Amino acid sequence: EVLKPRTLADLIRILHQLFAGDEVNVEEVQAIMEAYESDPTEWAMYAKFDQYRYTRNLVDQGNGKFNLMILCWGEGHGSSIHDHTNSHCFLKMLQGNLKETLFAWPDKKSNEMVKKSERVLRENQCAYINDSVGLHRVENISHTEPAVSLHLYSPPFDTCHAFDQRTGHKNKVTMTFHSKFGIRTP
Ligand SMILES: [Fe+3]
C-alpha cells in the first residue's frame, strides 16, 4: 500500500509533504524513496562525474527542511568512514551498486576500527543511517561501471567527520557540491 512516485518530480513533491512537520516517519520515507523506480532519463542532468572522487550534485533544497542530492561514484570510487552530523540520512540506489560497511564508534583510545555490518545495496534499494545507527563507509562495488545514488538529509548539513580506520581518530571535513540544479559549481 506504499505510495509510489511515478517520477523523480513526484518523489520530491511527496518529500515536501512528509518533512513539512515536526515528525518524520523513517520507514515511510524509506518505502517511498524505494518505490520510485530509478529512471535515468529523469536524473541524467544531475549525473556529473569526476575522474578521481565521487561527486555530490544538489537536486532540491527542500524548503530548508531537507536536501536531496545525487552522488556519482566513478569506477572504484568510495567514501571515507564518516558520520552524519546528527541528521536523518536516506540513500537510494539509482544505478549500479554500493557496498555499505557499518562501523562502531571509536572511544578516546586509539584502536583499529570495528565493522558492525556489511552489505551491498540492491537496485532501487533505500538504506537509512543516523549517528545512533553507526558510522559507515560507502563504495562502488565495480571497477568497470559507475554507481549513482540518491541521498536525502534532514536537516541539511555540510560538515562531517572522517575517521582513520587504523586508529579511530577523526577530522572535520567540509562537504561541497560539484553541481547544483544541474549547474556546475566550481
Ligand atoms: Fe554517508
Side-chain angles (χ1 to χ4, degrees):
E1 72 286 63
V2 179
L3 170 61
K4 184 171 185 307
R6 301 225 307 112
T7 71
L8 178 57
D10 282 1
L11 171 58
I12 296 170
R13 176 160 30 251
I14 300 168
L15 293 176
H16 274 99
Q17 301 286 336
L18 293 185
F19 287 87
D22 321 302
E23 304 186 354
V24 29
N25 191 316
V26 166
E27 303 205 29
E28 182 179 15
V29 178
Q30 193 166 6
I32 289 171
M33 290 272 284
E34 194 160 292
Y36 165 61
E37 281 175 34
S38 177
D39 189 343
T41 301
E42 294 172 349
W43 50 256
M45 63 175 296
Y46 308 109
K48 306 189 178 296
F49 283 74
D50 177 76
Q51 177 173 2
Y52 298 110
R53 68 183 173 78
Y54 71 94
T55 59
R56 309 170 72 267
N57 304 276
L58 184 66
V59 174
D60 200 90
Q61 283 189 329
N63 193 21
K65 298 302 289 274
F66 63 82
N67 275 7
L68 188 66
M69 57 186 80
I70 282 175
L71 270 61
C72 296
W73 315 78
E75 300 165 1
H77 290 181
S79 76
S80 63
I81 300 168
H82 60 269
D83 64 1
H84 297 85
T85 317
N86 301 298
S87 292
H88 298 282
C89 295
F90 300 80
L91 55 164
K92 176 222 173 59
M93 293 305 317
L94 295 176
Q95 184 183 324
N97 305 92
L98 295 171
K99 174 184 165 171
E100 177 191 46
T101 305
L102 201 68
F103 284 90
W105 283 84
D107 52 45
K108 292 289 188 182
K109 312 172 235 298
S110 170
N111 264 113
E112 181 77 19
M113 294 184 60
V114 184
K115 295 181 178 182
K116 297 193 309 182
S117 185
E118 237 179 353
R119 58 170 166 185
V120 173
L121 306 180
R122 303 170 161 261
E123 183 168 44
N124 278 308
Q125 178 179 357
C126 185
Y128 173 75
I129 189 163
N130 63 45
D131 285 350
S132 82
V133 173
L135 306 165
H136 76 181
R137 169 170 69 204
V138 165
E139 61 211 319
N140 189 351
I141 59 124
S142 177
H143 296 91
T144 65
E145 303 290 348
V148 184
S149 49
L150 178 72
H151 293 235
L152 210 199
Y153 301 159
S154 179
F157 65 95
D158 65 349
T159 58
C160 65
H161 301 99
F163 295 75
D164 177 355
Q165 190 174 352
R166 304 285 82 88
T167 68
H169 295 322
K170 63 180 185 292
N171 286 137
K172 190 166 191 158
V173 159
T174 297
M175 308 151 78
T176 60
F177 287 108
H178 184 79
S179 72
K180 305 180 175 185
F181 322 123
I183 298 155
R184 268 293 266 126
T185 62

